[PDB]
Amino acid sequence: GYTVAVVGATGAVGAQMIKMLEESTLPIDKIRYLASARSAGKSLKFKDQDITIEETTETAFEGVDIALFSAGSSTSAKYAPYAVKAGVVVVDNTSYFRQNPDVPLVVPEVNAHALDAHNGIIACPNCSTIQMMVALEPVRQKWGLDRIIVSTYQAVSGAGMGAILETQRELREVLNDGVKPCDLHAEILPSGGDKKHYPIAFNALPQIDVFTDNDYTYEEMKMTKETKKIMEDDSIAVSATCVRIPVLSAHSESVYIETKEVAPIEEVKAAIAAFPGAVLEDDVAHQIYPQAINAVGSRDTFVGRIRKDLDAEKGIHMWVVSDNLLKGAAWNSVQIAETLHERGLVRPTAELKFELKLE
Amino acid sequence: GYTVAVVGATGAVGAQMIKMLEESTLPIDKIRYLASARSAGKSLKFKDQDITIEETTETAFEGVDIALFSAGSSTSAKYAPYAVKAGVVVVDNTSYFRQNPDVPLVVPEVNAHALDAHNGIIACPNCSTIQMMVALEPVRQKWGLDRIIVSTYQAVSGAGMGAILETQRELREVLNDGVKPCDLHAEILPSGGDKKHYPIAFNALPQIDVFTDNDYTYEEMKMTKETKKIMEDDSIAVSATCVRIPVLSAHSESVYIETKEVAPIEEVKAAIAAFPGAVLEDDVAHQIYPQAINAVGSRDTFVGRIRKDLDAEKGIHMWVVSDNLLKGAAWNSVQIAETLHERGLVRPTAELKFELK
Numbered sequence: 001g002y003t004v005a006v007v008g009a010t011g012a013v014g015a016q017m018i019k020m021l022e023e024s025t026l027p028i029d030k031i032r033y034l035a036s037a038r039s040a041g042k043s044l045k046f047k048d049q050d051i052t053i054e055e056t057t058e059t060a061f062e063g064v065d066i067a068l069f070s071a072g073s074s075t076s077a078k079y080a081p082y083a084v085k086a087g088v089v090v091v092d093n094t095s096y097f098r099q100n101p102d103v104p105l106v107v108p109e110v111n112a113h114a115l116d117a118h119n120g121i122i123a124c125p126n127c128s129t130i131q132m133m134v135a136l137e138p139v140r141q142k143w144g145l146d147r148i149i150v151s152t153y154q155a156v157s158g159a160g161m162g163a164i165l166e167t168q169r170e171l172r173e174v175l176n177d178g179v180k181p182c183d184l185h186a187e188i189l190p191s192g193g194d195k196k197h198y199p200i201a202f203n204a205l206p207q208i209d210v211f212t213d214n215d216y217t218y219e220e221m222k223m224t225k226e227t228k229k230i231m232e233d234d235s236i237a238v239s240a241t242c243v244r245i246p247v248l249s250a251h252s253e254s255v256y257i258e259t260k261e262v263a264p265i266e267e268v269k270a271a272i273a274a275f276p277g278a279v280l281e282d283d284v285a286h287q288i289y290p291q292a293i294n295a296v297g298s299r300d301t302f303v304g305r306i307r308k309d310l311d312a313e314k315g316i317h318m319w320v321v322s323d324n325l326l327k328g329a330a331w332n333s334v335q336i337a338e339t340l341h342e343r344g345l346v347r348p349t350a351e352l353k354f355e356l357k358l359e
Numbered sequence: 360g361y362t363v364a365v366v367g368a369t370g371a372v373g374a375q376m377i378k379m380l381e382e383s384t385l386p387i388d389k390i391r392y393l394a395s396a397r398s399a400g401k402s403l404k405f406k407d408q409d410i411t412i413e414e415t416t417e418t419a420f421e422g423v424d425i426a427l428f429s430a431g432s433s434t435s436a437k438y439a440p441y442a443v444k445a446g447v448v449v450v451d452n453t454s455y456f457r458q459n460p461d462v463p464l465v466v467p468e469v470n471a472h473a474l475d476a477h478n479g480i481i482a483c484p485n486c487s488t489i490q491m492m493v494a495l496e497p498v499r500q501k502w503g504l505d506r507i508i509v510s511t512y513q514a515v516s517g518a519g520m521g522a523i524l525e526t527q528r529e530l531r532e533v534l535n536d537g538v539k540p541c542d543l544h545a546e547i548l549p550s551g552g553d554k555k556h557y558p559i560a561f562n563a564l565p566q567i568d569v570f571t572d573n574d575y576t577y578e579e580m581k582m583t584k585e586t587k588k589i590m591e592d593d594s595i596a597v598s599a600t601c602v603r604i605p606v607l608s609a610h611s612e613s614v615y616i617e618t619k620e621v622a623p624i625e626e627v628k629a630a631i632a633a634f635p636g637a638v639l640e641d642d643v644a645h646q647i648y649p650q651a652i653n654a655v656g657s658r659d660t661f662v663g664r665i666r667k668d669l670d671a672e673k674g675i676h677m678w679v680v681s682d683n684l685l686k687g688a689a690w691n692s693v694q695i696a697e698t699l700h701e702r703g704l705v706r707p708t709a710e711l712k713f714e715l716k
């Protein structure tokens with residue numbers, strides 16, 4: 001069996017990493033929980049066993065086969081290469097390595113083939129991107145993809161435990177204490193690192209991550225660049241608007257595409273239904289469509305409201321929902337680990353290709 | 360001065376109609392409040408004055424100069440033609456008369472000219488449509504509009520007072536009693552008239568109004584058809600996805616357009632800023648953009664996140680927010696009543712064009 005390390009075990013994603021590993025087929029002989037100085041020393045369960053949380057360091061990875069990183073870009077940047085040097089295979093949840101040509105950016109249903117040539121780090125795409133890829137890959141396979149326009153409806157848990165607590169606190173102030181939404185004090189949303197913070201309670205915030213110099217946010221640009229890389233096709237035009245709404249868990253997306261060939265809607269429904277990881281929830285006569293609240297807890301990605309555009313011959317609209325901490329993060333990661341095991345790819349990389357940041 | 364009736368004074372829109380009328384320049388000699396049998400006899404303020412609510416009937420409209428209807432399609436269908444017969448000019452917030460070619464469908468900043476030839480009923484468009492017209496008309500004026508793709512983020516007040524209360528109750532159950540959202544009981548959303556009801560707390564429901572034969576909802580199709588009539592151009596391609604989110608007041612819209620000619624973004628910003636009823640809130644260096652919670656209570660429509668498509672030469676994306684009960688409903692209506700007064704159009708109509716029911 002394997003020695004598995006979860007880096008960022010104590011946060012929003014980490015708690016789901018733990019659940020997904022508890023429910024995994026991976027043969028696990030030993031679990032180790034890593035976090036920051038703040039949590040180092042506390043205790044947390046794996047199944048019935050108590051595990052002591054360790055501060056993440058350059059030397060914490062000795063004897064580790066697999067490490068799942070969900071502790072923020074800076075932490076992956078700093079310690080993931082030292083894990084690779086020590087012999088680990090890393091599955092990284094953060095943005096840091098996603099656009100690195102030496103790193104497979106993987107959604108196992110779509111591009112598991114990219115895993116074979118790994119160099120010790122496999123990157124998880126962004127949650128919003130992952131569910132979109134699960135919905136669209138079956139379509140792309142049969143009728144091609146010319147362009148995508150997407151407006152997202154993103155849950156606060158995407159911004160971490162702190163953002164969940166902040167959201168809940170704000171809603172309680174308004175609903176129980178009669179505070180006006182515009183009078184609320186926010187500390188984290190829309191983005192913990194940006195300069196100004198706004199309330200999410202009864203609001204919709206058209207900012208996720210920070211602004212880039214083209215006036216799209218990094219979240220929007222991630223959807224653009226990550227799609228191109230995952231589908232191995234720079235020609236696919238992708239523009240996004242990424243919006244936070246008062247939902248704790250599960251992202252929703254209004255997705256527009258234009259195919260290369262005309263894709264009959266009833267065949268699109270069938271192809272999506274037949275694709276692993278994607279579930280068709282689309283029966284308007286009984287008001288059946290994906291909903292954030294029903295997606296929570298499921299590893300599947302749900303697709304519905306599938307219909308042709310009223311004007312564009314090759315245009316198609318749909319609604320895609322998935323739990324952003326499961327398929328959007330922890331399940332994708334564990335599923336990559338499982339796929340690595342299946343393909344005999346859990347073993348040390350001889351040649352280090354990633355900059356060591358701590359000398 | 361005028362005698363003004365508010366039909367549906369007791370509901371979510373009615374309450375704002377009262378507010379907008381209280382704050383209006385319209386010379387009002389007499390105010391009357393009309394609702395259902397079950398509100399008749401109740402008292403409701405107009406400023407400091409106590410007004411007794413009356414039941415809406417076929418003969419309630421004698422002496423009325425202006426009637427603002429926001430009592431539901433069925434109520435406008437039944438009584439509006441009788442109001443017109445009594446010599447009223449009706450401003451209707453409902454969908455019932457919107458696609459009647461004898462009925463102007465008006466956003467006063469966009470197509471005030473359409474008021475002049477009215478036959479006693481003016482229709483206010485759908486809330487989601489109105490804010491989009493305010494944002495896009497100044498762009499259309501300078502560079503044309505070829506197509507629109509919009510995804511909405513719509514407040515629950517759009518489905519009425521009952522929906523607001525249901526949403527508040529749901530949220531309280533999850534936050535205070537630890538109910539899982541998927542175990543909540545619902546009775547109104549997504550649509551009161553449809554067969555099945557679903558929770559909106561911590562949800563996003565991709566259904567507003569009922570489904571039509573083509574698998575778009577009536578809300579989505581109203582956005583398409585109303586745009587074409589307002590802008591007087593059936594060639595504008597319009598497709599919508601309308602989604603309810605857990606916000607009580609103010610609709611937000613992610614809008615994508617393709618113009619006929621390329622529109623420099625700084626000029627697009629300037630045009631919108633200069634358009635009456637539209638306010639530019641767009642300074643991403645300081646994270647300035649429209650926000651539902653900031654829009655609540657304002658008559659203005661706020662526009663931001665304005666940017667070129669990454670690939671389509673003539674493509675532009677933006678974010679448009681407005682209070683759905685003000686510009687989306689009660690303010691658009693009062694503003695039509697004010698424009699009618701300005702233009703000397705508050706007078707009986709000779710020709711009866713609407714069948715008595």
Ligand SMILES: NC(=O)c1ccc[n+]([C@@H]2O[C@H](COP(=O)([O-])OP(=O)(O)OC[C@H]3O[C@@H](n4cnc5c(N)ncnc54)[C@H](OP(=O)(O)O)[C@@H]3O)[C@@H](O)[C@H]2O)c1
Binds near residue numbers: 009014034039093
């Ligand atoms: N695939 C996706 O789309 C997706 C979705 C969500 C998140 N993510 C990624 O996962 C990261 C964490 O997300 P989250 O929502 O779980 O955040 P979170 O709830 O804020 O938790 C942050 C976690 O990182 C740990 N951490 C912070 N600084 C550290 C350091 N210097 N060394 C070691 N550990 C450190 C924290 O440990 P302490 O308890 O000790 O602070 C905690 O376990 C995000 O920053 C993002 O990069 C990806």
Ligand SMILES: NC(=O)c1ccc[n+]([C@@H]2O[C@H](COP(=O)([O-])OP(=O)(O)OC[C@H]3O[C@@H](n4cnc5c(N)ncnc54)[C@H](OP(=O)(O)O)[C@@H]3O)[C@@H](O)[C@H]2O)c1
Binds near residue numbers: 369373
């Ligand atoms: N009296 C009651 O117990 C009662 C029962 C049901 C609904 N309502 C109204 O509706 C609200 C409940 O939620 P909602 O979402 O349904 O309201 P809403 O959409 O916010 O407003 C509905 C409006 O249409 C009016 N209306 C309904 N039937 C009518 C008729 N036959 N003739 C003239 N006007 C009519 C209502 O007046 P009415 O107040 O006369 O209904 C109300 O002003 C209440 O706040 C109240 O305004 C009242």
Ligand SMILES: O=C(O)C/C=C/c1cccc(C(=O)O)c1C(=O)O
Binds near residue numbers: 096
């Ligand atoms: O906000 C969301 O819905 C998803 C958040 C993702 C996220 C948040 C903070 C940092 C990062 C990051 O690693 O840069 C990321 C990410 O792209 O995975």
Ligand code: NA
Binds near residue numbers: 274275277278279
């Ligand atoms: Na499937």
Ligand code: NA
Binds near residue numbers: 341342343344
């Ligand atoms: Na094998």
